[PDB]
Amino acid sequence: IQAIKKELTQIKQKVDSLLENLEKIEKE
Amino acid sequence: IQAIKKELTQIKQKVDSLLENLEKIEKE
Amino acid sequence: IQAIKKELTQIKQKVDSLLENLEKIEKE
Amino acid sequence: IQAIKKELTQIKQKVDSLLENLEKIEKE
Numbered sequence: 001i002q003a004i005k006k007e008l009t010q011i012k013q014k015v016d017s018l019l020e021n022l023e024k025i026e027k028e
Numbered sequence: 029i030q031a032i033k034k035e036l037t038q039i040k041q042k043v044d045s046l047l048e049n050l051e052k053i054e055k056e
Numbered sequence: 057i058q059a060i061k062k063e064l065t066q067i068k069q070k071v072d073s074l075l076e077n078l079e080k081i082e083k084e
Numbered sequence: 085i086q087a088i089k090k091e092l093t094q095i096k097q098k099v100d101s102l103l104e105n106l107e108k109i110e111k112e
Contacts, residue, residue, distance in 0.1 A: 001050045003112035007102050011043045015036050022029045026087035031084040056059050057106045067099045071092050078085045
C-alpha cells in the first residue's frame with residue numbers, strides 16, 4: 001500500500017504539472 | 029489545451045480511485 | 057495485484073491516446 | 085507537442101514502474 005500511495009500521488013502531481021505547462025508551453 | 033486538460037483531470041481521478049482501492053488491502 | 061495492474065495498464069493506454077490526439081494538433 | 089509528449093511518456097514509464105513494484109507484493 002504505502003509506497004504505491006506515494007507513487008500514485010507523484011503521478012497526480014506530474015499530471016497536474018502538464019495542466020500547468022499547457023497553460024503556457026513547458027514551464028520549469 | 030481543453031481536450032488534453034479534461035483527459036489529464038480524468039487521469040488524476042483514475043489515479044485517485046486507485047489510492048481508494050489500495051486502502052482496502054489484498055482485495056480483488 | 058491483478059485489478060490494480062489492469063487500472064495502471066488503462067492509465068498507460070489513455071496517456072498514449074493523448075500522444076495520438078496531440079499529434080493531430082487541431083482535433084478533440 | 086514535444087514537451088507534453090515527453091512528459092506523457094514519463095507518466096507511461098512511471099505507471100509501468102508501478103507494475104514492476106506491485107509484482108513483489110510483500111515489499112514496497
